[PDB]
């Protein structure tokens, strides 16, 4: 089905941002593994796998809409040096990506692209569950301290 050019452009931009998220989440997961923080590894890895599924769905939607998926471009990665900075960078990226998703859902509704909108709404609920998790982690660092919080991440389960 020939999709709207604006919808394909928005999907390609959400795809760029999902790929940037995959890369940042995997680098952060492996930086966490390198420090022995295994539960943070596990969370960031499953989140990178999740954005992997999201990018897969966006590529398939851009292909179905007879567009050209743009896997070449990536955004700038925010790689932190320590756990708090990495969590803040992840938070900032989730927030930017949620703003982007909301703009794309608005445009998909304006163009009567309703299955693109359903796709983007699944991506939105997932990204906003991870936003919830990151805010929980920040509150936990504020509550128990960074040393106690990091001690809880040593064991993966």
């Amino acid at each position: 089905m020939k999709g709207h050019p604006k919808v394909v452009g928005q999907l390609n931009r959400v795809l760029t941002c999902e790929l940037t998220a995959i890369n940042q989440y995997f680098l952060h997961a492996r930086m966490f593994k390198h420090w022995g923080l295994e539960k943070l590894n596990h969370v960031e890895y499953k989140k990178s796998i999740e954005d992997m599924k999201h990018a897969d769905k966006l590529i398939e939607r851009v292909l179905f809409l007879e567009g050209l998926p743009n896997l070449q471009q990536l955004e700038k990665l925010r790689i932190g040096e320590h756990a708090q900075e990495m969590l803040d960078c992840d938070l900032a990226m989730v927030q930017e990506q949620l703003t982007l998703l909301r703009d794309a859902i608005t445009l998909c509704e304006a163009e009567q692209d309703y299955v693109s909108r359903d796709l983007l709404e699944d991506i939105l609920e997932d990204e906003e569950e991870h936003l919830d998790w990151l805010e929980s982690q920040r509150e936990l660092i504020g509550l128990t301290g960074i040393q106690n919080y990091l001690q809880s991440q040593i064991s993966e389960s």
Binding site: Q95, L98, R102, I105, T106, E121, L124, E125, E128, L131, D132, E135
Partner: protein
Amino acid sequence: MKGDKDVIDALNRLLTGELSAMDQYFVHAHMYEDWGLNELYERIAHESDDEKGHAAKLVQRILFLEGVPNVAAREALNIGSNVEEMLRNDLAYEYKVADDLRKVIALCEQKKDYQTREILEVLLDDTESDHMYWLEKQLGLIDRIGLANYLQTKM
């Protein structure tokens, strides 16, 4: 995240509605059990549990949106005295909840708060396709077989 102020107010009104629904379904289920009408007791008790699930989802959403859930306020309960009256009160109240849910879904669409929109859409789908439809079926059955036959099936 920081939710829209109007979206949190509307979510809190929906929460008041769900909590009042829980109370009304609770007392109605137990009034059905007091009368030996165990099938209505079980159905209405499970609906009170579903209202508790909806209220949990709304409270979680209000807290995520950095709002203060209002579990203290309660709407006026309309308790019936006989089976038809309690079924009609439950139906009136489901109608009011569905209307208010539609208003808040429209508001969430205007305020770009899409995720609250799907939470409320799941709530509206339950309200319509789970118990408004059931109540209309029950009142139609009372109309078809009569109240004494209808109550006989509910024991």
